[PDB]
Curated annotation (Swiss-Prot), chain A:
Domain GAF: 141-305
Organism: Deinococcus radiodurans (strain ATCC 13939 / DSM 20539 / JCM 16871 / CCUG 27074 / LMG 4051 / NBRC 15346 / NCIMB 9279 / VKM B-1422 / R1)
Whole-protein residues included: 7 to 321 of 755
Function: Photoreceptor which exists in two forms that are reversibly interconvertible by light: the R form that absorbs maximally in the red region of the spectrum and the FR form that absorbs maximally in the far-red region. Also has a slight blue shift for the far-red maximum. Could also absorb green light. May participate in regulating pigment synthesis like the carotenoid deinoxanthin which could protect the bacterium from intense visible light.
Stated consequence of mutating H249A: 100-fold reduction of chromophore-binding activity
The record's account of how the chain is modified after translation: Contains one covalently linked tetrapyrrole chromophore. Lacks the cysteine conserved in plant phytochromes (at the position of Met-248) that binds chromophore. An engineered sequence used for X-ray crystallography forms a thioether link to biliverdin through Cys-18. The natural sequence can bind phycocyanobilin and phytochromobilin in vitro, but the identity of the natural chromophore is unknown.
Domain of life: Bacteria
Binding site for a tetrapyrrole: C18
Domain PAS: start-end pairs: 20-88
Protein name, UniProt field: Bacteriophytochrome
Family of the protein in this entry: In the N-terminal section; belongs to the phytochrome family.
Length: 313, 315
């Protein structure tokens, strides 16, 4: 099963009980964005991140009464149609708001049962993706495909280190390709225990295909209330990219000297084949539109891995 | 019966009939569609060899001036990028794309690929979260039918085409329309089946390597290359990989007779085989700009993946 989260007086996590930390329900988010939850029917704002006032420019109480209808007039009917009752928690809808306080915000919404989860992040506003797609497809074998993928991602993102991280049948991990800035340790060829990515993290990575820690030293921002009014239970945040990262994993990243981390799942035959894994030495908020490019690349790599593995077997 | 290609018309080959379809050399027509321009150049020196006859009007230069310069001089910023992206021996399927600001012609999209020692350069005029939203909707579709319907509707919304269908090949190469989105008033092709010879065996082979083809105007005359043969080889210039390549006059007659002014289809490739087509129709001529066509190319790949996934959920 899972332990209760901390804020419901559950045990603190150790290397004895890695597998039991309820990473989906931390009750908090990373501070480079803001999150609101809301009722599926009424559009009634039920929870907000204590930092919402910053991003939205709204007097705190104003929000926690109001309706999405009021708050987002153009958007609220689109949401209603895009995310019908009963849809999967994996389905997401995005829009760009030109919002008074903040030039442009990206809005990302998904639905978990009766709750809409809304994420707001700063945003903005060429051929590198098309060029990359053809490059991946003409790679002659899996090894070269891995090399092209890591190089392409590094060029698109500027990340200090990009890895392709392949799982063995026992969930042992192996770095099979790597693109990195001069003057970093090489992780190429190295293998790591299964517990470095626990079973509960791997399952959630099979369904929700991108996550990040924008700053490995930033404090999480609580949800208020912490419990969903609807259920008097924790809000599931696994489908939210703003979700606070596990402190265990933040400790792991800090001990390696990483300041910003991001990975993308490569899913083949319904299973987690590996990850595009990115390190930066310093804090780094990759903007939403560039993340989208990596999300596309994730799908394309999933296709090409199967194609390429089929021409060996 | 499968038989080798006839020589093209310009090398004294025969004219093509319903009898000998499968032998038309549709990859070497010696000509392009008039809404863009094409140059060929030597892959090592960058000497310009062939150009479409309309090139002066896209590029704003006399032929003899174009042909008298190397790509190093014509494309000083792109020439080194081309050479890195398209190394000798690379496959003909690999494409490099850039946007140019050309004085006379505005923003041009440049698409380049390499066939042996030849570079092929295509120039076309070029111009929010719809793709991301579509990607997730496709993935959440519960079964093959719902996927097919979401895919057709999405493509129609992105493009404005009068008719978007999902054409699926059977094992005998007969095809069947299994989903479609269509303009009000058009009659339905859903569930109709069409014989294998409608897309003969050599088109289907080409459609497995080069994943998008089109006919922007089913009545437009083709524009010859000049000279027609590659001076490197005194042989035909391979245009299989060029979206500007002229459509078979057989297929254009088949389209005009249906009332179709514009045609475009994307290959859906599963396990190395052509599974089906995103086929689109417009009643009037219609040019879809290169950046919009890129969205369809990306959806072609997504759909190939999702078709595998939906079919595996099915035994
Ligand atoms: C008690 C268990 C511990 C534990 C937990 C844990 N680990 C993650 C997530 C990740 N761990 C990763 C491991 C590596 N990253 C690398 O770069 C290398 C090699 C150089 C390794 C071995 C990765 C890639 C992830 C994914 C997240 C990311 O991209 O940064 C989690 C889940 C984090 C979250 O989503 O909140 C957890 C709970 N880690 C340990 O080391 C043990 C002691
Ligand atoms: C003598 C041979 C004939 C022939 C040849 C032919 N057909 C193509 C390409 C296509 N044919 C297609 C057929 C259909 N389009 C539809 O809308 C329907 C049904 C409602 C069918 C059956 C399609 C989709 C294509 C693909 C190209 C496109 O999307 O427009 C070629 C190759 C053309 C080229 O690439 O230059 C050839 C040679 N068709 C016949 O009917 C016989 C007489």
């Amino acid at each position: 099963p899972f332990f209760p989260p901390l804020y419901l007086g559950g045990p603190e996590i150790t290397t004895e009980n890695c597998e039991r930390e309820p990473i989906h329900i931390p009750g908090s988010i990373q501070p480079h964005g803001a999150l609101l939850t809301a009722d599926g029917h009424s559009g009634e704002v039920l929870q907000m991140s204590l930092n919402a006032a910053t991003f939205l420019g709204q007097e705190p109480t104003v929000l926690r009464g109001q309706t999405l209808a009021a708050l987002l007039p153009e958007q609220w009917p689109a949401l209603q149609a895009a995310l019908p009752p009963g849809c999967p928690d994996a389905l997401q809808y995005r829009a760009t708001l030109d919002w008074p306080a903040a030039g442009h915000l990206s809005l990302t919404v998904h639905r978990v049962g009766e709750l809409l989860i809304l994420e707001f992040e700063p945003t903005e506003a060429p051929h590198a993706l098309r060029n990359a797609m053809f490059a991946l497809e003409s790679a002659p074998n899996l090894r070269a495909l891995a090399e092209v993928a890591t190089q392409t991602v590094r060029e698109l993102t500027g990340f200090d280190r990009v890895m392709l991280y392949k799982f063995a049948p026992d969930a042992t991990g192996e770095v099979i390709a790597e693109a990195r800035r001069e003057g970093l340790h090489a992780f190429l060829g190295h293998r790591f225990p299964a517990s470095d990515i626990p079973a509960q993290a791997r399952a959630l990575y099979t369904r929700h295909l991108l996550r990040l820690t924008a700053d490995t030293r930033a404090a999480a921002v609580p949800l208020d209330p912490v419990l969903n009014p609807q259920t008097n239970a924790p809000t599931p945040l696994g489908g939210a990219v703003l979700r606070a990262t596990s402190p265990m994993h933040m400790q792991y990243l800090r001990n390696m000297g990483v300041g910003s981390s991001l990975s993308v799942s490569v899913v083949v035959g319904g299973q987690l084949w590996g990850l595009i894994a990115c390190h930066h030495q310093t804090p780094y908020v990759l903007p939403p539109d560039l993340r989208t490019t990596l999300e596309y690349l994730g799908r394309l790599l999933s296709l090409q891995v199967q194609v390429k593995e089929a021409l060996e077997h």
